[PDB]
Design a binder for this molecule. Sequence first.
Ligand SMILES: [Cl-]
Ligand SMILES: [Cl-]
Lengths: 479, 479
Amino acid sequence: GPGPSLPYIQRRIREYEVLDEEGLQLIERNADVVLEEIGIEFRDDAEALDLWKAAGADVRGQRVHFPKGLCRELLKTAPKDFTWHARNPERNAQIGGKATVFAPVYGPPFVRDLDGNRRYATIEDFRNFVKLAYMAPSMHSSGGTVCEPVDIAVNKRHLDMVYSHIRYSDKPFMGSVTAPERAEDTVAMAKILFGDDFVENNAVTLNLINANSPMVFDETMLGAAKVYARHNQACVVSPFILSGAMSPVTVAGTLTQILAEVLAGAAFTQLIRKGAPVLFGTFAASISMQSGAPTFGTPEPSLVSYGAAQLARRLGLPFRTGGSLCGSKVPDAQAAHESANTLNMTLLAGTNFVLHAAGWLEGGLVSSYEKFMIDQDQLGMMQKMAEGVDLSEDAQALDAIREVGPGSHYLGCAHTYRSPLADNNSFEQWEIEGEKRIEQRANALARSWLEHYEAPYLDPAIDEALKEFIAKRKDSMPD
Amino acid sequence: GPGPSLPYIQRRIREYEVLDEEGLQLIERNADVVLEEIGIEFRDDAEALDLWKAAGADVRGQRVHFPKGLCRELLKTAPKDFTWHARNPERNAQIGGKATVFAPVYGPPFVRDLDGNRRYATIEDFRNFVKLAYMAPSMHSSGGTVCEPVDIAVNKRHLDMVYSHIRYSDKPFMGSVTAPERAEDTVAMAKILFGDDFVENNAVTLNLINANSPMVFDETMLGAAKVYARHNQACVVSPFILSGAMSPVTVAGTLTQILAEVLAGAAFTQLIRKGAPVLFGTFAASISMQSGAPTFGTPEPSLVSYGAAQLARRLGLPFRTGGSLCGSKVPDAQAAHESANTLNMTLLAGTNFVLHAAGWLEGGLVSSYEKFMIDQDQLGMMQKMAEGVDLSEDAQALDAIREVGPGSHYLGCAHTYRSPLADNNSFEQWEIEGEKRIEQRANALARSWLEHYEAPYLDPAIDEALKEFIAKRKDSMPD
Ligand SMILES: [Cl-]
Ligand SMILES: [Cl-]
């Protein structure tokens, strides 16, 4: 199996910037214009409209028009950083500041299984991804909807999904957002696990709250946000954008829209509870001008995300974007270039929370076991990169340079990250070993990890209470 | 075929830094210590030793010990930037400053051909790579030893290699460095092409001058450097390092050794001719602690190269490092992650000259047609990325945001880089089209490009004179 899990990354390296002060001010000014003149829809949520009117916004039907600065002022109560608590406290993760936390793929209804089949995902696959995330040394979070399990009823599956993050991992996990009652169920389960007062006082979940970009928040998302914000749980407020389709085709226009959507949605959390933890999220990709298809790994989404990180730091919210994203159907060089381009930006932008750090394929439709293994290996490289350059006397190596001297070599001397998947052997050895592509070695490694997996301890009293809760909830509803 | 070729990149984006002022001063101070106490070998070149003694260095056998600051002072005459002239002046490339110039793979004795065979490279393959580099829109240079042609005698092949860069391309090219007489032949050919006085006054070649790291320059390399520096041609002074083997295993120790080697070798060019153009080069990879094998795409080489770029800017020399480097045997996700990690650093470090920007596979032993096509596509993305964020009124897109408004989409409106190799189609379409990996599409595209290729015009009088020169030189030697 793998080594021990590493804690969250603390970046010693700098954030890479694409906008100068004038550009940042321009985008900020333009977002305030959008918020006042155009507004943001808060749909099918009368309570939300009442909250906005009370806060001093101008509500016209379902469109909320914001006085300049209001959202930013309301966000003064949001924490710049906070702890995401894990049931094993050694796995707690900082969200914000110099920290970077990797989480798995979220959302796919299909898997590419270890036998090469593209098929609907099941609870068995969900559990397998939870297991692999538990074992992956640089996967800091267990995640959320690692895949969508087809073989449990839609109104019940959330219970099994949350349970899986508790039973098969001890890393911090995400909650259900698919209906407000499911968010309530997540909170109830969390209270069984951590204690009632503990949950009211500490974030134990991050929860994905998408905007229906452009410039709409819908009932379901607002409903989950209201539950989590009332219980001190974190909302990842995330525009969902393909530039050219759900936002302008340009970087600057996309950033402006993103900032407007985040200001409104994040400020909303503070209207529910001052101090509720909230992140500035962004999902941003491009479209093919030929096809209209979603495209990844291209320059425009990287520039958007670098810029958005700058805007997030200035707003004072922890930032989520990026991951190992791609549009390829197979874990080939396209998948890898796209994922690598996105992941390198993710680290260098100083991203605090990385959804989709491993496992995404096919534009988000697939959770791939092989891809997960390849990506998690990259995550270990990013974790090591983030430590930056050691400048200790030993690292300076002057005695080694002296002792070796010109014309010698350093292999023998005392002074003199490791991928388990890269093949660094000669052609001849690699040909003897079956001319294998990396995904074949990834397949074998996933199988090996799953064979050696041992579940982290769970108090049997807590397990029983969770199972009793789940059973009661399932019995209260027909499928 | 492809679109028109683009000129050299002018970066509008910032350089990413890994060392702060104290760290930079530390490395600079430590390199001066190495140069004085340990020295650098200049082997089997009595003239070089005499030049160093005359300049005020302390020569002990073949070891040159340098007073502190001497090399840096001598380098004051080296140009911070210069033009690399092409026979078609529209293809001239700036070397230095904010410019970035991509060149092909250099060195492999094997190819992976379009039929999938790993075999010794031939002059036909050399020509094919020159053709593909001519056509690739973001390949700014024709390169040098795009592969090593096995089917021409070792003492003659340089003539055909240089000729190929003239006949099949009009982009700036590199010279032969394999013996001093071959460098003389390159200069003679260049004078036939551009004119005698033109060559003495303008760089028309960049020429790879490796150190035999650690801390040795050998006769052959010094001999080529002496020829090119006397004729105003550029030397790319390049440590050749696997950290842990040819330099210390640490980043800081590697950087110190690199800076010492470059200071000595680059200053040497100014002893031959003040003002001779010279680059700070670095080839830097790691080794597998298990195997001892060369490894790429890992954190340590990226940190070395980011740092080395900082040291190069402070020294005042144009910088070469990076490229699309990897150790994989096949153009798979390993090849792509490694190449992408290296290439993203290459751009963000502000690299001026990128050897090996496309085509390298198998740790430098292979020039791959498929890999070249995949990599050159990435180069187009890097070219577009380098332009940074447009902040024009049109790019701000406020009228588009207004006209679309919340709940609509931007696909239809007036306001609303393209890979020819990414598959961005649905699973269903991609399955109908043969479940193809990107390298299969790359194969087809290379074949298509080579079918449509038309050689750039060459004056028949110049062609005849080159052929007469070549024939005379070949007839003067047995193979
Ligand atoms: Cl059930
Ligand atoms: Cl011949």
